Each structure stands twice: as structure tokens, then as C-alpha cells.
Amino acid sequence: WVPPEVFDLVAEDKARCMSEHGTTQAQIDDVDKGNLVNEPSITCYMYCLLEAFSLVDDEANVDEDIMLGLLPDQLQERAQSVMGKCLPTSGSDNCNKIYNLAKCVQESAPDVWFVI
Ligand SMILES: [Cl-]
Q1: What are the domain boundaries of the chain?
Q2: Residue 84 CA to ligand 1 centre (angstroms)
Q3: How far, in Å, is the centroid of ligand 1 from the Cα of 79?
Q4: CATH assignment of 1-116, given 1.10.238.20, 3.30.2130.10, 3.30.565.10, 3.30.70.360?
Q5: C or N terminus of the chain, fewer CB within 10 Å?
């Protein structure tokens, strides 16, 4: 997890989402080291990618079933647990909703919130 196959299937959406939002790979790496700031270039990137895979709707409500279904078996209990705490999402906008969600997951259970 993330399994290598996923990276090829996400490549085009990753590229578009970074281009749309001004995202750098260094920002993604930061999020993945647990450093998250409320900067739209990274927060809107995370929303963009979740939306590309139908994990969120037009108001950044999470499809928890689809999200669960994407994760490895050994993470799913921990993920369900973190989502019971961290959903529903709230924020000033779709990007900020996902930032708050990312914080909440990082604060509660580190290894769940990985961002491709
Ligand atoms: Cl939600």
C-alpha cells in the first residue's frame, strides 16, 4: 500500500491536478511526511485527486465505502476507525474541508493519510 499498479492508473489525473492547482512534488512529499499547511496548491490538489477517483462529491463529502474498498485489508479497521472520528468533513470550501480531514487523520492515525 499504495500498490505499484495504482500509480500508473493515477498518472494522468495526478498530472492534471498538479497543473490545475500549482502543486509541486515537494508539497506532496511534505504531506506524506506528515507536514500539512492550509495552502490551496496542496489542499486543492488533494481534493482534485479524491474527486478524480469518486472518493468525494461536489461538496467534499467522502464516499467512505469506496475509500474503504481501495485500502489494503490490514488498514481497513484503522481507516474505518479514523473516519468515524474524522467524518463528516467540514471547512470553508472543498479544499479546506480536505485539509481538515487530512489533519484529523494524521493526528489520529498517521499511516492512513498517504497522498499520491
Ligand atoms: Cl463527509
Answers
A1: 1-116
A2: 10
A3: 14
A4: 1.10.238.20
A5: N
